Copies of this chain bind each other. A is one copy, B any other.
Amino acid sequence: SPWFGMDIGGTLVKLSYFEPIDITAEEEQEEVESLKSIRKYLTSNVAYGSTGIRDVHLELKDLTLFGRRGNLHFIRFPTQDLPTFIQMGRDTVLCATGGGAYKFEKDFRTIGNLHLHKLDELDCLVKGLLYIDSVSFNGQAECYYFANASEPERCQKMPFNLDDPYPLLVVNIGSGVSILAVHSKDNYKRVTGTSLGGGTFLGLCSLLTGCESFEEALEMASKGDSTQADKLVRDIYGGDYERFGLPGWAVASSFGNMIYKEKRESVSKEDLARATLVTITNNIGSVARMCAVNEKINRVVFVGNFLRVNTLSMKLLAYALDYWSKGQLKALFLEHEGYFGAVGALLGLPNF
C-alpha cells in the first residue's frame, strides 16, 4: 500500500507521504489503477480540494526509506475537513498520531479492511524530529537559529548542528503548548504544557479583529503596534525599574492599557492583532525559559505550526529567550517544524 504517516491535531491534519522513485518495469505493471491514481493525484497537484496544501518547498528528495528510494512529501489540511478526506478514501495500514487518531478512530474504520495503528504523539514527535535532522534537508541543516538576535541590523538565520542532540527542550506550539525534555533517543518526558498557544492567538485575534485566517491575523499583526494595547514598565514607573533590571519597554500587563475606555476606542485592529501575537509569544518563551532552567537544558527548540510563515514570532522568541536568559538559552527552529509527528508515525510502519 502507499506509505503514509498522519498526525491528526486539534486544528490541522499533517500527512507525510513517501513517493517511490525506483519503481521497476514489473512493479509498474503489478500496480492497481487506484494506487496509480492516488500517486499521480498527490504528485501532480499542489492544492487538494479547497483546503489541502502540499508544502512543496519541504519535500525531501531521493530519500532512502525502508530499503526504497523516493521523495518524502508534506501535506496539510484542516481537521474540520477530515470527513471529506475519509469520504475520498471510501471512493492500507495507516499509522496515525495526534489526539484525532483516538477521536476519529471509528471514522477511519469505515474504510473497509483499513488497519489503523494509533501511535503516541510525543513519541512520534521525537522520532520524526531526530530522523529528519539526521537525514538533513536535502543536504542543508534542518535546524537553525537567529544569530545576533538582539541587533536588528545583524539578526539573521544561521544553521545549527544537532548531531549530538541531547539534552533538548522541545516546545511544541500547536493549538496549545506541550513542553518535552529529551535526554536520549529513548528517554524523554512531557515536562508540562500551557493553554496559551496557537489556538489562543487565532481565536482571540478573530474575536478582536474579525480576521478569518491565520495568515490574515499575521498580516494584521505585522502592521500593528502592540504598545497601544499593552501597559509597559515605563507606563507604570516612567522609565526602567532599575532595582530588578526591568527595562522600560518590557510589557508589565498585556492588554493592560485596554482598561481605559478612551484607549479601547483608539486602538486599531492591527494593534490588537500584534498585542495578541506578542502576548502569546512572550508567554511561550517565558514558560520555555522556566522549564529549561528547571530541567537544566540550555537548547530550546520550537516546533508546531504556530510558527509557520511567522517570522515575527520566531524573531520575538529568539530575542526574548536570549535577552531574558542573559544569553544562557538559545532559541532553535526546524524547517519541518509542523510535520515531525506525521513523520514519526510513518516511521512506525515496519512494526506492523
Q: Which residues of A contact B (CB under 8 A)?
A: 9-11, 80, 98-100, 102-103, 120, 122, 175-176, 190, 192-200, 202-204, 206-208, 212, 229-231, 233, 235-239, 241, 243-244, 246, 251-261, 264, 272, 279, 282-283, 286-287, 290-291, 293-294
Contacts and interface: CB of A to CB of B under 8 A. Distances in A.
A102 B238 contact: yes
Given A103-B237, A236-B100, A255 B290 contact: no
Contact of A255 (B9, B199, B235): B199
Copies in the assembly, this chain: 2
B203 A229 contact: yes
A176 B256 contact: yes
A252 B212 contact: no
A199 B10 contact: no
A303 to B, nearest CB: 16
B175 A102 contact: no
Main secondary structure of the interface of A (DSSP, over half): helix
A190 B258 contact: no
Which of A229, A241, A257 is packed against the most chain B CB atoms within 10 Å? A241
A235 B282 CA distance: 26
Contact of A272 (B194, B206, B207): B207
B283 A203 contact: no
A195 B272 contact: no
A304 to B, nearest CB: 12
Nearest to A233: B99
Contact of A293 (B252, B254, B294): B294
A206 B98 CA distance: 36
Contacts of A200: 253-256, 279
